[PDB]
Write a protein that binds this ligand. Structure first.
Ligand SMILES: *[C@@H]1O[C@H](CO)[C@@H](O)[C@H](O)[C@H]1NC(C)=O
Ligand SMILES: *[C@@H]1O[C@H](CO)[C@@H](O)[C@H](O)[C@H]1NC(C)=O
Length: 402
């Protein structure tokens, strides 16, 4: 959609680049809300209304074709990101799901480079990504997410999408959802927006999940029909890694009973380990809390290979069929090598209560406990803070107390 007159005021976020010899060096980045979370209205003279709802093509009165949609639908800048639950402070990013005014902005943001006009493209195969988190205000059913999508670096800036990454255009993920704009262009045919997705972190104070999701496509693919469905071009489920799913129940949770005690802040380290041919072979997650490294658990379950890292043998054995068919760990790594955009979000699930994250096989949350209607009794204002985003050489992003 066409940018409007209102100023976009991106929050500034200091991050780090790390090497063993040089330590962690600060860098300037900016934060941008998803394009379709900006106010979208019709051009002057065309009356009231927007330009479409999630899940659908844009309305054909203003968007009969891409060219018309591009002139007839206007996307306003956001001058105060706090109105959407997004604030920064130094090296910290705070995402508020619910505001005191009662709004539920459920923000999703991307990391922009220092120019504000191109996403910060991360190339993580053979490297590590680390962040600090405060998960205390995330009960059952909440998902704080920090993940990578194979979005285009400029948000696919083009004649009809002049806003680009500066306005957060170009979102895609492994769910192939239909949005009224894709790559900043009106989605006349109602295609889904598909791409490879590495879910570094999907977690609350009750469970922590990691999952690569492959697609058989490079970059953003517009899917039709069955291509967007479970048997299509992307892996909806992912290859999931959650201590509870592998019968380790004392690793992560609220209290001293857990190794990673989510009542306190902690550091989350993710290494993307390559083989000698430079292809991704293993994904390794460990933590740091109270100045001490917390190594990964090993799996502890019948039928699950004994491992402390995600790899093809584990993914296959645990039933990650589309993951394997659509490229497996090597395919995920090829996307990481090409370059990915960092997305951070907070959300809840009216339909399914986030049960896959923290209920049953996946955690301690009871049936119904993660419903949004229950979340608000437990934590009226869910929120997450990510701090000290940093990436670089294996072994360089963390430091134990001496
Ligand atoms: C920012 O974060 C710091 C450290 O948690 C805190 O003490 C201060 O009160 C917060 N706000 C600023 C810097 O606006
Ligand atoms: C969990 O692990 C214990 C061994 O530590 C084993 O005895 C038990 O059967 C396992 N339970 C499940 C549900 O897999």
């Amino acid at each position: 959609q066409k940018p409007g007159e209102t100023k976009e005021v991106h929050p500034q976020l200091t991050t780090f680049r790390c090497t063993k010899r040089g330590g962690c060096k600060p860098a300037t980045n900016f934060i941008v809300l998803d394009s379709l979370s900006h106010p979208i209205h019709r051009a002057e003279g065309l009356g009231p209304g927007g330009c479409g709802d999630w899940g659908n093509p844009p309305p054909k009165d203003v968007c009969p074709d891409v060219e018309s949609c591009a002139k007839n639908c206007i996307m306003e800048g956001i001058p105060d990101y706090s109105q959407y639950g997004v604030t920064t402070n130094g090296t910290s990013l705070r995402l508020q799901h619910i505001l005191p005014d009662g709004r539920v902005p459920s923000p999703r943001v991307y990391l922009l480079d220092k120019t504000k006009r191109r996403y910060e493209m991360l190339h993580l195969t053979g490297f590590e990504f680390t962040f600090d988190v405060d998960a205390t205000k995330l009960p059952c059913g909440m998902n704080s997410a920090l993940y990578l999508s194979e979005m285009h670096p400029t948000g696919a800036k083009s004649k009809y999408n002049p806003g680009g990454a500066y306005y957060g255009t170009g979102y895609c993920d492994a769910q192939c959802f239909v949005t009224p704009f894709i790559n900043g262009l009106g989605n006349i045919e109602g295609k889904g927006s598909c791409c490879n997705e590495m879910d570094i972190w999907e977690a609350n104070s009750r469970a922590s999940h990691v999952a690569p999701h492959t697609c058989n496509k490079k970059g953003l693919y517009l899917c039709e029909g069955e291509e967007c469905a479970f048997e299509g071009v992307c892996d909806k489920n992912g290859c999931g890694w959650n201590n509870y799913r592998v019968n380790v129940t004392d690793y992560y949770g609220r209290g001293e009973e857990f190794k990673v005690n989510t009542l306190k802040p902690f550091t989350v380290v993710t290494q993307f380990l390559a083989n000698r041919r430079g292809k991704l072979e293993k994904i390794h997650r460990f933590y740091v809390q109270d100045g001490k490294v917390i190594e990964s658990f090993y799996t502890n379950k019948e039928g699950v290979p004994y491992t402390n890292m995600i790899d093809d043998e584990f993914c296959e054995a645990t039933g990650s069929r589309k993951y394997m068919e659509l490229g497996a760990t090597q395919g995920m790594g090829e996307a990481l090598t090409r370059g990915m955009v960092l997305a951070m979000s907070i959300w809840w699930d009216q339909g399914g209560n986030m049960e896959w994250l923290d209920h049953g096989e996946a955690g301690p949350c009871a049936k119904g406990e993660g419903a949004p209607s229950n979340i608000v009794q437990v934590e009226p204002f869910p929120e997450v803070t990510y701090t000290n985003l940093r990436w670089g050489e294996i072994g360089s992003t963390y430091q134990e107390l001496q």
